[PDB]
Each structure stands twice: as C-alpha cells, then as structure tokens.
Write an enzyme that holds these catalytic residues in place. Structure first.
Site, mmCIF file in Angstrom:
data_model
loop_
_atom_site.group_PDB
_atom_site.id
_atom_site.type_symbol
_atom_site.label_atom_id
_atom_site.label_comp_id
_atom_site.label_asym_id
_atom_site.label_seq_id
_atom_site.Cartn_x
_atom_site.Cartn_y
_atom_site.Cartn_z
ATOM 1 N N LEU A 152 0.816 -1.227 0.000
ATOM 2 C CA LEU A 152 0.000 0.000 0.000
ATOM 3 C C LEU A 152 0.856 1.287 0.000
ATOM 4 O O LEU A 152 1.489 1.563 1.016
ATOM 5 C CB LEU A 152 -0.919 -0.033 1.214
ATOM 6 C CG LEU A 152 -2.065 -1.079 1.097
ATOM 7 C CD1 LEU A 152 -2.550 -1.537 2.487
ATOM 8 C CD2 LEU A 152 -3.253 -0.680 0.216
ATOM 9 N N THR A 153 0.909 2.021 -1.137
ATOM 10 C CA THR A 153 1.672 3.292 -1.252
ATOM 11 C C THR A 153 0.890 4.307 -0.439
ATOM 12 O O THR A 153 -0.287 4.482 -0.676
ATOM 13 C CB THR A 153 1.813 3.740 -2.709
ATOM 14 O OG1 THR A 153 2.762 2.884 -3.338
ATOM 15 C CG2 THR A 153 2.343 5.225 -2.880
ATOM 16 N N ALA A 208 5.239 0.283 -1.908
ATOM 17 C CA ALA A 208 6.199 0.176 -2.994
ATOM 18 C C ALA A 208 7.392 1.039 -2.688
ATOM 19 O O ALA A 208 7.217 2.197 -2.343
ATOM 20 C CB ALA A 208 5.545 0.583 -4.310
ATOM 21 N N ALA A 240 3.789 -5.924 -11.274
ATOM 22 C CA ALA A 240 2.383 -5.594 -11.686
ATOM 23 C C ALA A 240 2.089 -4.164 -11.973
ATOM 24 O O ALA A 240 3.014 -3.309 -11.913
ATOM 25 C CB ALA A 240 1.415 -6.040 -10.635
ATOM 26 N N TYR A 257 3.768 -0.954 -14.154
ATOM 27 C CA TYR A 257 5.086 -0.398 -13.956
ATOM 28 C C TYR A 257 6.093 -1.157 -14.856
ATOM 29 O O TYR A 257 5.661 -1.770 -15.844
ATOM 30 C CB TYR A 257 5.439 -0.367 -12.453
ATOM 31 C CG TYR A 257 4.474 0.536 -11.710
ATOM 32 C CD1 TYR A 257 4.476 1.889 -11.967
ATOM 33 C CD2 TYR A 257 3.531 0.034 -10.800
ATOM 34 C CE1 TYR A 257 3.610 2.751 -11.313
ATOM 35 C CE2 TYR A 257 2.639 0.895 -10.143
ATOM 36 C CZ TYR A 257 2.694 2.240 -10.396
ATOM 37 O OH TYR A 257 1.853 3.125 -9.760
ATOM 38 N N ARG A 296 5.346 -9.975 -7.438
ATOM 39 C CA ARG A 296 4.003 -9.599 -7.779
ATOM 40 C C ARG A 296 3.749 -9.467 -9.272
ATOM 41 O O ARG A 296 4.466 -8.747 -9.965
ATOM 42 C CB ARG A 296 3.582 -8.283 -7.108
ATOM 43 C CG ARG A 296 2.092 -8.330 -6.713
ATOM 44 C CD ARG A 296 1.690 -7.019 -6.060
ATOM 45 N NE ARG A 296 0.515 -7.141 -5.211
ATOM 46 C CZ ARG A 296 -0.434 -6.210 -5.063
ATOM 47 N NH1 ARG A 296 -0.447 -5.064 -5.757
ATOM 48 N NH2 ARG A 296 -1.421 -6.450 -4.221
ATOM 49 N N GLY A 341 -5.901 -5.211 1.047
ATOM 50 C CA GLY A 341 -5.393 -3.888 0.852
ATOM 51 C C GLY A 341 -6.157 -2.835 1.625
ATOM 52 O O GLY A 341 -5.795 -2.467 2.715
#
Ligand SMILES: Cc1cc2nc3c(=O)[nH]c(=O)nc-3n(C[C@H](O)[C@H](O)[C@H](O)COP(=O)(O)O)c2cc1C
Ligand SMILES: NC(=O)c1cccnc1
Ligand SMILES: [K+]
Ligand code: NA
Length: 355
Positions: free
Chosen positions: A23-24, A55, A173, A176, A223, A314
């Site tokens: 979770l950013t 991330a 994922a 990116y 991921r 999440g």
C-alpha cells in the site's frame, strides 16, 4: 487451511493466512527517506501474517511517486531500521516491495526522462510535487542498460536485508516497468526482450535470478497482475504470457507469488479479462497469494478450494489495523478514507482505532 492457520513460505512461518497487500501511502520525505510515523503505522498492523511494504523505489530513475520511500541510499536503509524493528518487536514479518515505475515516473519527481520497454506516453495524470501533471515521453531502455538495472535491483535487495526486512517482493504488476515488458500493448521491442513470450518474461526472469543470487530464493517474492488493463498496460491474450511467466517463477522456487486479480465488478481493477489464478495454480507450485476485492468469506473460500494459500488485504488494512481479530469477532470493518490514502500527515494513516 484456515485463514488463521500458520503458513510456511521460503525461510519463514507466517502466523496466519491474512496478509497486508502493498500500500503506497506517501508518508516519507520529499527525498524518499522513510519517517518515524511509518514505524507506528506498520506496528499497528503487525498481526498481518506478512506485511508487504508500500512500494519502495530501487533507484531515483525508478521512483516517481511523490513522498514514497526508496531503498538505494545508506540514509534510506538507516531510516527503515525503526520500521522493521517495530514489526519484529510486535512479532510480525515484513517484506519490502522493490519498485521500478518505468514509464509512470514523472520527471518532476526523478528529474530525468522515464524508461520503458518501448517509447510511449502513459495515459493520464501522475501525482507530482507540483500537482498532477501528465506523464513524459518514455525512452526505450537499451539492451546495454539491462546490466545496470539488474545492479540497481541487486543493491536494493541487499539494502533491504540491511534495513531489517525479512526479504523482498519484486513489483512486476500494475503497469510499472516489468509489467510493461511482459504485456503486448506496451512491449513493442524487436530484440531478445520483446516479441516472443519468453522474450517478454525475460526481464522478470533475470531480475528474479539476480535477487535470488543476492538474498536467497527463500526471501524472494514476485508480484504480477495478469488480467485487466491498468495505466495503459494490458495483454491481448494474458493466458499465453502469464502462464509461462508463472511456470518460470515456480521453477526458480521463489518464496511466494502474489497477484492482484481484476474482476468484471472490480473495485481496484475492472475487466472481463477473466482471472487466471485457476490456470496459474496448476503450474505454480510454491505458495500462491491472491488479492483484490476479497471479503473474509471469499478469502476463506479461496483457501478451501486450494487456489489460494493466503490472501492479502489492501484497503481493509488501511482502516482496520487488527483485521484478523475483526474477522473472527465478526466486528464491522471501518471504511478507509480515500482522500487520505496518499496525503502526507498522520490523519487517515495511524489514527484508525484498533478494536
Ligand atoms: C492506497 C492504495 C495504495 C496502493 N499501493 C500499492 C503499492 O505500493 N504496490 C502495489 O503493488 N499495489 C498497491 N495497491 C493495490 C493494492 O495492493 C490492492 O491490490 C488493492 O487495494 C486491491 O486489494 P483490496 O481490494 O484488498 O484493497 C494500492 C492500492 C491502494 C488503494
Ligand atoms: N502498484 C499499484 O497499483 C499502485 C497503485 C497506487 C499507488 N501505488 C502503487
Ligand atoms: K495516476
Ligand atoms: Na528487526
């Protein structure tokens, strides 16, 4: 298996199968150095079997998210220490998500042109340090730059061990850098990293092999997001490319594979490209951790079928520090405040009550 049953993975036993998805949150510094408050945030959620970190940029080139943390510098490693220490004091485990944002890196943030498998301009508006801006025109990464990129991933992975993380998950994922190479809407390369399925998973493969050679497979995770379009990244026949990816990953014997799967009625990924976990389960032998839109009941249903070994949550972990407890108690879940997902202060970050 019970959501509340331990799970062996890599060199570890998680206390349960109810995990924290990456979770950013943007509570690090302008110069991507983690901060003291991030320690409290993660400690609160240490009842997660595994916390996958927000991330974390492997280099400035790959880090375009404003106020997200990196892990390329000594000062970054040092700043992470309190976070990982806190998690381990609370008895938990944490993996670092290692992040190269590819075409999605705003120049306002990195200070340079973003790189990608192929030249293009991401659709949309990126968060920056002066408002949203549209994305830059990416340059196609040169074959002769892949050795460097790999060293960037190597340094980051060792820096993660120094920082106290139990290991790393490679962000491949969500549109990116690695995911752009995998999918045929974004990868238009004529060399050994594009065209054929094995060429398209070649970056995933070499970056995984470089991490495994650095920190051991038993601390190395991946991921993927094989189904549904995201940030202009989609594949025309995802089964053709993600099933061979999953098999290549399984042969390396990585610690786990996490995947976020989009859905027809999906709330972080909407698509009729169907979910490939059933087919990926058959070729992927290590633990398979599924994500996106699970309830307590659907998460345990997935465990009961054998398709998932664990499930990450999440947005639930955002407002529900002690999710696992709220599950078994049949306690209402607090709803997360979308506006405070990515603001910079403790409000909507460490101020959600535990039970
Ligand atoms: C605020 C927010 C931040 C996110 N940050 C990341 C990230 O850093 N890395 C990543 O792979 N996915 C990230 N995701 C996607 C989530 O991991 C997850 O896949 C999504 O929340 C769907 O799961 P859920 O329905 O359990 O919340 C993020 C999602 C949200 C809402
Ligand atoms: N990887 C992702 O989908 C993501 C989404 C939002 C913020 N940071 C990362
Ligand atoms: K955006
Ligand atoms: Na520690």
């Amino acid at each position: 298996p019970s959501l509340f049953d331990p799970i062996r993975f890599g060199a570890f036993t998680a206390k349960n199968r109810i995990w924290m998805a990456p979770l950013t949150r943007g509570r690090a510094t302008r110069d991507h150095v983690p901060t003291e408050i991030m320690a409290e945030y993660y400690a609160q959620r240490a009842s997660a079997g595994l916390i996958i970190s927000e991330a974390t940029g492997i280099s400035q080139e790959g880090l375009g998210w404003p106020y997200a943390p990196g892990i390329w510098s000594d000062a970054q490693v040092e700043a992470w220490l309190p976070i990982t220490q806190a998690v381990h004091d609370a008895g938990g485990l944490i993996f670092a998500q290692l992040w190269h944002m590819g075409r999605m890196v705003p120049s306002n943030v990195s200070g340079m042109q973003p790189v990608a498998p192929s030249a293009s301009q991401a659709p949309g508006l990126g968060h920056t340090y002066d408002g949203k801006k549209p994305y830059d025109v990416a340059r196609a990464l040169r074959l002769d730059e892949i050795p460097r990129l790999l060293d960037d991933y190597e340094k980051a992975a060792r820096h993660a061990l120094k920082a106290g993380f139990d290991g790393v998950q490679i962000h491949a994922a969500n549109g990116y850098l690695i995911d752009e190479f995998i999918r045929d809407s974004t990868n238009h390369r004529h060399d050994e990293y594009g065209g054929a399925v094995e060429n398209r998973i070649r970056l995933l493969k070499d970056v995984t092999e470089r991490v495994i050679a650095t920190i051991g497979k038993e601390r190395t995770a991946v991921r993927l997001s094989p189904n549904g379009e995201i940030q202009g990244t989609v594949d025309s026949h995802p089964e053709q490319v993600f099933i061979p990816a999953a098999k290549m990953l399984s042969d390396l014997d990585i610690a786990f594979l996490g995947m976020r799967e989009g859905a027809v009625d999906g709330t972080f990924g909407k698509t009729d490209q169907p979910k490939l976990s059933p087919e990926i389960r058959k070729v992927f032998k290590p633990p398979l951790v599924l994500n996106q839109d699970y309830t307590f009941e659907t998460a345990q249903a997935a465990l009961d079928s054998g398709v998932a070994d664990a499930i990450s949550f999440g947005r639930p972990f955002i407002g529900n520090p002690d999710l696992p407890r709220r599950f078994f108690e049949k306690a209402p879940l607090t709803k997360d405040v979308i506006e405070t997902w990515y603001t910079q202060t403790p409000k909507g970050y460490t101020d959600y009550p535990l039970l």
